[PDB]
Symmetry: D2
Subunit: 410 residues, 4 copies
């Protein structure tokens, strides 16, 4: 027996040679993209033979073997329906329907704080999916860049814990939700911020990352991190939104001084510089596609699913998912934890970073916010999603009424 | 082919016949108990053949099939190691280690506010396990009855939602945690109690179950329900602790009158009777074994794992696990959700009802409480549990460090 | 020289005999009423001589001497303008204009939570004055009975301190205002009610009065007290209001059980009987005239100005005035102390018991309440009052701009 | 008749000539000081004639009148025991006892957050009195300069209301005390600081004074203003304390940014300049004598009692006295109002500015503070003060137990 040849006959159809396009559409049907970094060696040798013998273009059994040799094990699971979502083609059409149901909920008002988010038009709406296995799909405005804003708070919290450990980080910031009556308080009762997802907590967390180095190298350190989470897809930076966040963070300056007075930063902290670093981190840009890979990195125990390098310790992604659960959506986190039951983080540019643990990561983006600060279309999508699939943290995997389970076949 | 006969040879070893003791010892190894309700027809026909002629306790291929015919699909799933924890005999050996390691944490104070918990000894400590498949194990004082107290709060919430639906119930009670600055408040901004796990909420939820019937029959109804959840294992009642809660619930009466004044009960409520009903509900008795089965009913989407009966609507069970997550351990719910990440509910008798969704249900019980109200041994156990296995709600099932996963071989 | 005799000539005006009616109106102009208990001896012998020498209504120098001999010292202070308000006749016309200006403020809603307060018409409006010297004036519906409701809280607090002293009472009850959103909280940090003027505080105080006796004599003990404070004018009791307040005091019972749980009562307290007693004290009736004298005993260091009876210790009256200043008018107490700056207590029947220390007491009554619980016309009257006179707690008695000073002459 | 020598024989003894020393000693007996500004012309005229004659240090009836002619009306009330305290010489002997009893209370901690208050000795302790009539007395370290710190809070609030009126000023700051459970919050429910006596309130009040001019002229405006209030006694400035207050007022900047974000300042405010000005205002220096005169301007309806100048509108003095009543002693304000019943304001240098309305003003100073921020010796002194005399705001002027009344003679 030989794994490359058994997969040959699977696609061969009892026939004698396989056209390459028939192989290519067979592959994309799995949800894989031909640009997948785990597939480069296979694709590089297909493009080569598609030069060496323009003659063709059909593959013997032993040239198919020459190309899939390198990435055979990943290819077999794709064609033997072993990915976490086996029928990826039907799942994506569900996403498409869920997308179009959100697309009609046209309320909310775009963030007006700076001329840079006000710049964004309300009809932009994109969702993109990345599974824990690398299967992708997008629909809508998924290649438009936008800033993470408070979508970055879980990403840097993971880095802090990854680099420093739970006990250190949570010596400086709590691990509970405020309570719907304390969106106004900076500190909890032990004089630490309530959790990493609130502005005072995010700021203290920023104060821990890569201490003793200057603000340029801290920034590069975090972005090399954010690149690994996204498999080197688009991670950018808008100086435009940074400058205006610099002139309008009166409240953040209020928090900054309060924290200095109550000695909540590590010793030797330059608080006014830390705020600048914090302002920068909120102006990091992503698209819906690149961020969906980040979310899937958290969904995948810290391994970036399209590259397979370990980016975060399991201790960091577990901690981050727990605090996204309960403190991820501003005042909506209680209701969101109840009705949707997914770790998510929302941001004021209209982004909602969504994680379905052990399944997939997502990014939804629509600039118009509701009155609690969350993307209107995004929130509508996430209710529609859990109402359709048994992804709620406390759905049952065995008995789930008329919910669909995409992890199953028939 | 013949699957009753296929299983005969699995246990028979290609040898003559199966001694019956060798069959049941194989059976207990799976984690099933011979008293399993789904096995009665098999056991009934074992009791029949053991009267045929008392020695030569051996089963041919056709008398073995004579007994296992009725329950063959469940028996093969056990013997083809298809249960949620395949190597169950090894998992229980870890339970034993976790239990006996927790046994050494002898700090805490027994609740003394009533003489009925004050008579309970601090050295009692029991742990019982029930999988989503009916595999059982216990260690310690697992057959001693004790009151649920506020471990009953999620159970009646489930009943309420099961019978009346999310939207009605949550017209009368919120669905978020108070906030560690609010175990002192009864009502949130909308003048409803914060969630079903706090006393004002539980009291309101109690006012929803089986309205229009009197308190005797409401109680009979809830007992019938808890019987379904526990597979007809021990559910009782101690009139003693009921009396003392009745003479000692000044705080409960304070809450009741606040709720009556701010009109949080359904119309036609006899508020002072509902308090009486509530006191009864907290004096319902369970053992660790019986209650662990109730926990497993929640772990299993509302189906009782030792009977197969559908006991709760999926909407009821999801909701309850959701609110056990964030509001289940008094002031410890935040720290508990973060470190343990399992839906749990604690009570002042020393109980902790624990759910590991899609795996198993649990009940731990040792009366000495910590200064937040949670059983000291219990809390130590659930930390040790999640630290050993990847049962944390936000562990990864694929990449989980040096944690052990009992669902795998 | 001669005590009665020059006082004869002061009123005689060089004449031989004084018409008796001319004596009576001269006396009434001082503000004294001829029914004053400190004047009974003089009046008894005035009508007696109007029988014994029934023909000829005039008094020589020695028959005037026959009648005023008993009350001469009080009589001279009245006629030598030595009373706290010398020109009482001009002060009253101001009261009347102030009354007529409030009579136009026709907004508000009458308390309807029980049918007995709903019984009262919105157009009733009464004001009565009693100085620290016994001068009286009324205008409007000043002889209509109504319940004190929370106007009784300062009065029973005084009895408690009078009988037990500051230090004991304030073991069980605070002495500060809540803070304008701690009105739903029953207890402060030390697990005592915030002050005696909140319902929880009043209830605890009720628990200290005459401990160890049954409710009938406790009630008679308190009422025996109030009669003295009012110089034995109308103090009554509405059984109707008592029944309906007990029927419907769910929140009060809520408070009662809460206080028992947090052990706020003295040992051996029967909590539900104390509640019954509290409801009774809230259904005690006064008219504007009878209560205005009670207010004056507080204005007068504890001496009832129309009888000379010492009714309350100076420690009791100081404490009670202190807490009416800051906590007496529900959520309006801060605004009321700022703008009016007088010790006052409001009640849900529409009464406002007002004290001008060292000057006078008043009670205003109009059933319509505003949305904080205070009589609309009542509150309007007290603003008008202090804008007119230097009665504000911190006006200056020497430099006071264009305010009028009734304690002074011309 | 001639009221110049009606007074001559009063001091003369039926005698001959009056020695000059006997006259001024008779004068200091009144409590007036020979340095009284209202006595300049008289003192200048004593200084002139005590040049002419080294022989005959004595005053005929015609040269006494030559000197006292101009200030005769003030001198007559002094010798005619018409001052607010007729027997001032005994009242100061009580002040001495009250001082010596406080001298024994050696607890507390000198404020150490800045080295400028930290080098102050713990045994410095001074008390100074100034009546509404200009009578003066001091005991202890009454000429040692120290900073007002938060004792300046009422003074600038007075200026603010004096220049713009109550209604404008209170658009930017409330008028009630927070409540002993909200000393941590910056803003009330209407998004204004709770009152002028808390740091958020003072900062906003600072933003209203003499708007539109630069900080140099703003400071000069307030400095003369305080000059008028103190009758031109010592008012200074410690640049040392100002410097240490700006490098360590982390909480103050936090407050400023919060107020800036929630738009609590009038439009056109340079928030960080207002903080600079505020720090300056807290580093104004006084002595006990000079500050007690400021207290006396507040006791006197806005007239400085040693110069006769009108410095504050009565509306300004009422308002400030009202808010010193309830918010003047930090978390001790409720207990202080209940037990002492006088408007006072404390500051962290150990000062307590105390007002007994219509009687006298005071400044007490001992740097050791208690655990709430008030001078230990200071607080002990004012308790002892009011238990001795009927100065409590709700004492009775007629029935006041065995308390002493310094306003009466026998
Ligand atoms: O909203 C309001 C109106 C509200 C309706 C009456 N006022 C506001 N004024 N300022 C605001 O901003 C923050 C600034 C930082 N700050 C703290 N946050 N956390 C703290 N510590 C604890 O709670 C520890 C417990 C005690 C042991 S103190 C105080 C408030 S809100
Ligand atoms: O209305 C609301 C809206 C708000 C948005 C959530 N919540 C409410 N929920 N229940 C209420 O009633 C009170 C009745 C008496 N009771 C207390 N009184 N005082 C207390 N605090 C202390 O004693 C100590 C602290 C230091 C002072 S707790 C408990 C609850 S209010």
């Amino acid at each position: 027996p030989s794994l490359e040849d058994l997969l040959f006959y699977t696609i061969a159809e009892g026939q004698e040679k396989i056209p390459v396009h028939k192989f290519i559409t067979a592959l994309k049907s799995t949800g894989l993209r031909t640009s997948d970094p785990r597939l480069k060696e296979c694709m590089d040798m297909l493009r080569l033979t598609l030069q060496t013998t323009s003659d063709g273009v059909m593959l013997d059994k032993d040239l198919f073997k020459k190309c899939v040799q390198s990435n055979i094990v990943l290819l077999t699971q794709a064609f033997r329906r072993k990915f976490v979502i086996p029928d990826f083609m039907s799942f994506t059409s569900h996403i498409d329907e869920l997308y179009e149901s959100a697309k009609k909920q046209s309320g909310g008002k775009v963030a007006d704080y700076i001329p840079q988010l006000a710049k964004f038009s309300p009809d932009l709406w994109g969702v993109s999916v990345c599974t824990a296995d690398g299967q992708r799909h997008s629909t809508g405005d998924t290649k438009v860049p936008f800033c993470l804003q408070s979508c970055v708070k879980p990403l840097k919290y993971a880095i802090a814990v990854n680099d420093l450990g739970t006990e250190y980080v949570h010596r400086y910031v709590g691990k509970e939700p405020s309570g719907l009556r304390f969106n106004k308080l900076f500190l909890n009762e032990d004089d630490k911020p309530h959790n990493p997802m609130v502005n005072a907590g995010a700021i203290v967390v920023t104060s821990l990352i890569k201490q003793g180095v200057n603000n340029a190298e801290k920034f590069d350190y975090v972005m090399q991190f954010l690149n690994k989470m996204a498999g080197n897809e688009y991670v950018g930076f808008s100086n435009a939104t940074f400058q205006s966040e610099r002139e309008s963070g009166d409240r953040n300056f209020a928090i900054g001084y309060y924290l200095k007075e109550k000695k909540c930063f590590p010793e030797g902290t330059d608080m006014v510089g830390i705020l600048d670093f914090y302002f920068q981190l909120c102006s990091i840009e992503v698209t819906c596609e690149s961020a969906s890979v980040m979310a899937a990195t958290l969904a995948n125990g810290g391994f970036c699913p399209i590259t397979g390098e370990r980016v975060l310790s399991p201790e960091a992604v577990r901690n981050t998912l727990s605090l996204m659960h309960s403190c991820g959506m501003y005042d909506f986190s209680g209701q969101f934890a109840f009705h949707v039951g997914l770790p998510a983080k929302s941001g004021v540019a209209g982004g909602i970073l969504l994680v379905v643990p052990n399944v997939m990561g997502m990014m939804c983006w629509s600039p118009p916010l509701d009155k609690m600060g969350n993307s209107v279309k995004g929130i509508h999508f996430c209710h529609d999603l859990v109402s359709l699939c048994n992804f709620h943290n406390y759905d049952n995997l065995r008995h789930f009424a008329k919910k669909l389970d995409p992890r199953r076949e028939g």
